[PDB]
Design a protein around this motif. Structure first.
Motif, PDB file in Angstrom:
ATOM      1  N   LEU A  30      13.309 -78.029 -65.060  1.00 15.23           N
ATOM      2  CA  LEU A  30      12.016 -78.664 -64.844  1.00 15.23           C
ATOM      3  C   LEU A  30      10.873 -77.662 -64.783  1.00 15.23           C
ATOM      4  N   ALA A  31       9.856 -77.907 -65.607  1.00 18.49           N
ATOM      5  CA  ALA A  31       8.654 -77.082 -65.649  1.00 18.49           C
ATOM      6  C   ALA A  31       7.828 -77.435 -64.412  1.00 18.49           C
ATOM      7  N   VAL A  32       7.697 -76.465 -63.507  1.00 19.86           N
ATOM      8  CA  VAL A  32       6.940 -76.646 -62.271  1.00 19.86           C
ATOM      9  C   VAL A  32       5.668 -75.801 -62.204  1.00 19.86           C
ATOM     10  N   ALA A  36       3.279 -77.731 -60.066  1.00 23.50           N
ATOM     11  CA  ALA A  36       4.178 -78.774 -60.596  1.00 23.50           C
ATOM     12  C   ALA A  36       3.423 -79.870 -61.311  1.00 23.50           C
ATOM     13  N   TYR A  37       2.553 -79.446 -62.232  1.00 25.21           N
ATOM     14  CA  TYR A  37       1.678 -80.324 -63.020  1.00 25.21           C
ATOM     15  C   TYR A  37       0.793 -81.139 -62.073  1.00 25.21           C
ATOM     16  N   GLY A  38       0.432 -80.529 -60.941  1.00 28.21           N
ATOM     17  CA  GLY A  38      -0.396 -81.177 -59.931  1.00 28.21           C
ATOM     18  C   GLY A  38       0.348 -82.011 -58.895  1.00 28.21           C
ATOM     19  N   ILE A  78      10.817 -67.677 -65.846  1.00 25.31           N
ATOM     20  CA  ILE A  78       9.378 -67.424 -65.980  1.00 25.31           C
ATOM     21  C   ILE A  78       9.134 -67.636 -67.482  1.00 25.31           C
ATOM     22  N   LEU A  79       8.327 -68.641 -67.818  1.00 30.77           N
ATOM     23  CA  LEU A  79       8.012 -69.017 -69.206  1.00 30.77           C
ATOM     24  C   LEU A  79       7.094 -68.062 -69.954  1.00 30.77           C
ATOM     25  N   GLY A  80       6.110 -67.526 -69.241  1.00 38.32           N
ATOM     26  CA  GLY A  80       5.151 -66.624 -69.849  1.00 38.32           C
ATOM     27  C   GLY A  80       5.457 -65.155 -69.637  1.00 38.32           C
ATOM     28  N   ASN A 128       2.272 -69.522 -81.960  1.00 41.50           N
ATOM     29  CA  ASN A 128       1.383 -68.361 -82.032  1.00 41.50           C
ATOM     30  C   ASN A 128       0.776 -67.924 -80.708  1.00 41.50           C
ATOM     31  N   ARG A 129       1.622 -67.991 -79.682  1.00 42.57           N
ATOM     32  CA  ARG A 129       1.260 -67.618 -78.324  1.00 42.57           C
ATOM     33  C   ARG A 129       1.863 -66.260 -77.975  1.00 42.57           C
ATOM     34  N   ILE A 130       3.169 -66.240 -77.715  1.00 44.05           N
ATOM     35  CA  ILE A 130       3.881 -65.005 -77.384  1.00 44.05           C
ATOM     36  C   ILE A 130       5.198 -64.972 -78.144  1.00 44.05           C
ATOM     37  N   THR A 159      12.169 -70.665 -78.256  1.00 42.45           N
ATOM     38  CA  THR A 159      10.951 -70.914 -79.005  1.00 42.45           C
ATOM     39  C   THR A 159      10.356 -72.179 -78.409  1.00 42.45           C
ATOM     40  N   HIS A 160       9.063 -72.354 -78.630  1.00 45.62           N
ATOM     41  CA  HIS A 160       8.353 -73.510 -78.126  1.00 45.62           C
ATOM     42  C   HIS A 160       7.685 -74.208 -79.297  1.00 45.62           C
ATOM     43  N   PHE A 161       7.743 -75.535 -79.279  1.00 47.16           N
ATOM     44  CA  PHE A 161       7.148 -76.347 -80.331  1.00 47.16           C
ATOM     45  C   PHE A 161       5.717 -76.744 -80.022  1.00 47.16           C
ATOM     46  N   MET A 195      14.096 -77.189 -76.512  1.00 50.17           N
ATOM     47  CA  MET A 195      13.645 -78.542 -76.206  1.00 50.17           C
ATOM     48  C   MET A 195      12.669 -78.845 -75.087  1.00 50.17           C
ATOM     49  N   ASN A 196      11.418 -79.118 -75.466  1.00 49.15           N
ATOM     50  CA  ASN A 196      10.398 -79.548 -74.509  1.00 49.15           C
ATOM     51  C   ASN A 196      10.496 -81.083 -74.519  1.00 49.15           C
ATOM     52  N   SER A 197       9.590 -81.779 -73.828  1.00 52.65           N
ATOM     53  CA  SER A 197       9.619 -83.248 -73.764  1.00 52.65           C
ATOM     54  C   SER A 197       9.699 -83.974 -75.095  1.00 52.65           C
ATOM     55  N   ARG A 215      14.198 -78.141 -71.474  1.00 56.09           N
ATOM     56  CA  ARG A 215      13.206 -77.342 -70.737  1.00 56.09           C
ATOM     57  C   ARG A 215      11.977 -78.243 -70.792  1.00 56.09           C
ATOM     58  N   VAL A 216      11.956 -79.201 -69.870  1.00 56.11           N
ATOM     59  CA  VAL A 216      10.944 -80.251 -69.823  1.00 56.11           C
ATOM     60  C   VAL A 216      10.047 -80.375 -68.595  1.00 56.11           C
ATOM     61  N   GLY A 217       8.923 -81.050 -68.801  1.00 57.85           N
ATOM     62  CA  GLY A 217       7.977 -81.288 -67.732  1.00 57.85           C
ATOM     63  C   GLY A 217       7.504 -82.725 -67.776  1.00 57.85           C
TER      64      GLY A 217
HETATM   65  C1  LIG Z   1       4.895 -76.355 -70.409  1.00 56.10           C
HETATM   66  C2  LIG Z   1       6.193 -75.813 -71.143  1.00 56.10           C
HETATM   67  C3  LIG Z   1       7.363 -76.642 -71.296  1.00 56.10           C
HETATM   68  C4  LIG Z   1       7.478 -78.162 -70.863  1.00 56.10           C
HETATM   69  O1  LIG Z   1       6.590 -78.864 -71.842  1.00 56.10           O
HETATM   70  P1  LIG Z   1       6.538 -80.518 -71.664  1.00 56.10           P
HETATM   71  O2  LIG Z   1       5.821 -81.296 -72.838  1.00 56.10           O
HETATM   72  O3  LIG Z   1       5.716 -80.810 -70.473  1.00 56.10           O
HETATM   73  O4  LIG Z   1       7.934 -80.984 -71.648  1.00 56.10           O
HETATM   74  C5  LIG Z   1       8.476 -76.101 -71.925  1.00 56.10           C
HETATM   75  N1  LIG Z   1       8.506 -74.778 -72.402  1.00 56.10           N
HETATM   76  C6  LIG Z   1       7.378 -73.946 -72.282  1.00 56.10           C
HETATM   77  C7  LIG Z   1       7.444 -72.486 -72.843  1.00 56.10           C
HETATM   78  C8  LIG Z   1       6.210 -74.458 -71.638  1.00 56.10           C
HETATM   79  O5  LIG Z   1       5.088 -73.652 -71.514  1.00 56.10           O
END
Ligand SMILES: *Cc1c(COP(=O)(O)O)cnc(C)c1O
Ligand SMILES: *Cc1c(COP(=O)(O)O)cnc(C)c1O
Lengths: 345, 360
Positions: A30-32, A36-38, A78-80, A128-130, A159-161, A195-197, A215-217
């Protein structure tokens, strides 16, 4: 103060199981990030494991430190990126740390001393972030981690979409194809996550070998990723209710202690609030920390006001607030002041 | 929740705050200035601003709720504090213990407080509704009845303040007609930023106190329409540093939805700031300042990160000025308002506690 966010533990638990059901993922992180997204960094992180969450994903080092100082022992990613001078701190707190360059690893090797860092390699496929963008650069990083196994543990790759929730999947397909080309024939670690949301809900079957981790929020916070365009809204449960109470009533107009400074933005002007199962119109402008509503008749001070949530036969949803204001659900919740009273129900 | 290990920061200027306080006192003619520190000091930091307030010439701190006043006291600050919003009557002894000038808006509140207050003398501030105010009494009789209650129950209360809140003419006339012939306390305050800057000499008998926020935080109330912008000093600079730098070819989409696509080989920097810090979605495409050059923030602003187009290669750790001075340029809150549609006071209040704050 009476203004508060009431987080539902049972709804979070429901959404976690639903996300795993649709995606097929056995592991959910869970992405916190951003309080935690407020919804509250510490309160959500505390009940996360009980709700079926396998790990927590933060954006910056300090959010992870805050979780650890609260006594939470859960897996943390840590995502970033983090400054290399903080590599010993990340190791001490046992964080799966995101790394974007070979230069970073070289500088970390010099200061880790007797400690071992859990490494998560960032791969850029189109966000195109990191992250690394060539097969050579990725291979060079993997080789270095293997050459210095005393200071590093190759634990993740990702990787992130940029648009996995978009009806137009052209960029998603470009990123997916780029991902598979980059990882082809390379040594894979224990955590291969993408996998994001949006990816978990609409593209899980298109991601073999990398669909075991979600890896969702957004979706876990009860918000349909595309907001009802590509998937059903009804199968997800809202995770919170934003409430307040009347602090003053005059002959009828009621005043409540919430304004733009608290996250009840000026863009929400004329969005009817719920009092005693009735929709109430706004009177005047939304001030910094106070606002007024028109009452159907006399109500005493302390009368509950529901801004987001249920009251009688009516319900104020995040989806309807988005359509009214132009502010996406995740941006509405993130904007709620971290100072607002937060509780778990 | 403060990200102390991250570069992204609000650098508050003590000297600029002091200048604005002195300037506000001069223009308005007010000898007493009370700084509105509600909503985390308009986003500048409640405790940070409160700590240096008196040294900067502020005579009192104005909060909205009881908790903000308690926060200031627990930080060891003994400054004069007034609560502008109403508090629950059961908390009257708490407000009295902390010596808060407490806002009251009903006779029934006073009657309930008189029953539970002992030896404690609550400093009372009477709210008057002169138009469409959020709180306060609306009639001469109701105001007179409150004043009379305070005077004969002076063992539990001290009639210390009376006020109203402006935006002007209908409100000003209504104010004078409501307080007409009634006993005035030591603090008769009505002047917020707008009234202090444009209407001070139209307020006889009630222009000795400036209860301000906006102007002291370096923002001209009408943003240069009715007064001069060049006479006020900005109280902060918002800075960050590049966490990642790369050269990408043409046809590359940047951030969510690929809203920006490169047209040639372009140097892109990543910044550790997003909407989770209060750098709102509508600020997209704002030209940030790096080494005295304007650099467009490209692509959608993510929750914790955003990207910027660079003129050439810069190393990791290169300073970026979002709001503030760099070279021949200066990014002001007015520049950000013109670009986004979000007013200066609304920009600053949106900054979250994750964004680290320091005094310079
Ligand atoms: C914010 C984030 C997520 C979760 O994205 P959601 O659309 O909220 O599921 C997953 N991975 C990374 C690298 C993020 O920055
Ligand atoms: C916010 C506030 C102020 C200060 O208003 P500014 O235009 O920012 O000067 C003064 N009085 C009350 C009652 C307030 O709520």
């Amino acid at each position: 103060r009476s203004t508060r966010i009431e987080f539902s533990k049972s709804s979070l638990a429901y959404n976690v199981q639903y996300t795993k059901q649709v995606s097929g993922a056995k592991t959910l992180w869970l992405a916190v990030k951003s309080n935690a997204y407020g919804h509250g960094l510490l309160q959500v992180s505390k009940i996360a494991r009980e709700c079926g969450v396998d790990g927590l994903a933060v954006s910056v080092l300090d959010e992870g430190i805050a979780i650890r100082q609260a006594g939470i022992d859960d897996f943390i990613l840590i995502l970033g990126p983090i400054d290399v001078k903080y590599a010993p701190i990340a190791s001490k707190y046992h964080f799966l740390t995101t790394v974007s360059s070979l230069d970073w690893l070289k500088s970390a090797d010099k200061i880790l001393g007797k400690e071992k860092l859990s490494v998560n390699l960032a791969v850029d496929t189109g966000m195109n972030r990191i992250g690394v963008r060539s097969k050579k650069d990725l291979k060079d990083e993997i080789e270095f981690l293997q050459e210095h196994s005393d200071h590093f543990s190759y634990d993740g790759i990702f990787t992130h979409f940029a648009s996995s929730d978009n009806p137009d999947d052209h960029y998603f397909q470009r990123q997916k194809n780029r991902w598979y080309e980059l990882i082809d024939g390379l040594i894979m670690p224990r955590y291969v996550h993408v996998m994001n949301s949006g990816a978990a809900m609409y593209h899980s079957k298109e991601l073999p070998g990398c669909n075991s981790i979600a890896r969702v929020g957004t979706v876990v916070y009860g918000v349909e990723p595309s907001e009802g365009v590509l998937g059903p809204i009804d199968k997800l449960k809202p995770v919170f209710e934003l409430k307040s109470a009347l602090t003053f009533v005059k002959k009828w107009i009621g005043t409540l202690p919430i304004g733009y400074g608290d996250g009840w933005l000026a863009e929400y002007q004329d969005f009817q609030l719920l009092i005693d199962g009735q929709k109430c119109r706004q009177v005047g402008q939304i001030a910094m920390d106070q606002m007024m509503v028109a009452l159907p008749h006399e109500y005493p001070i302390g009368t509950e006001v529901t801004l987001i949530g249920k009251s009688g036969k009516y319900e104020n949803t995040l989806y309807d607030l988005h359509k009214h204001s132009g502010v996406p659900p995740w941006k509405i919740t993130v904007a709620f002041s971290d100072r607002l009273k937060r509780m778990v129900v």
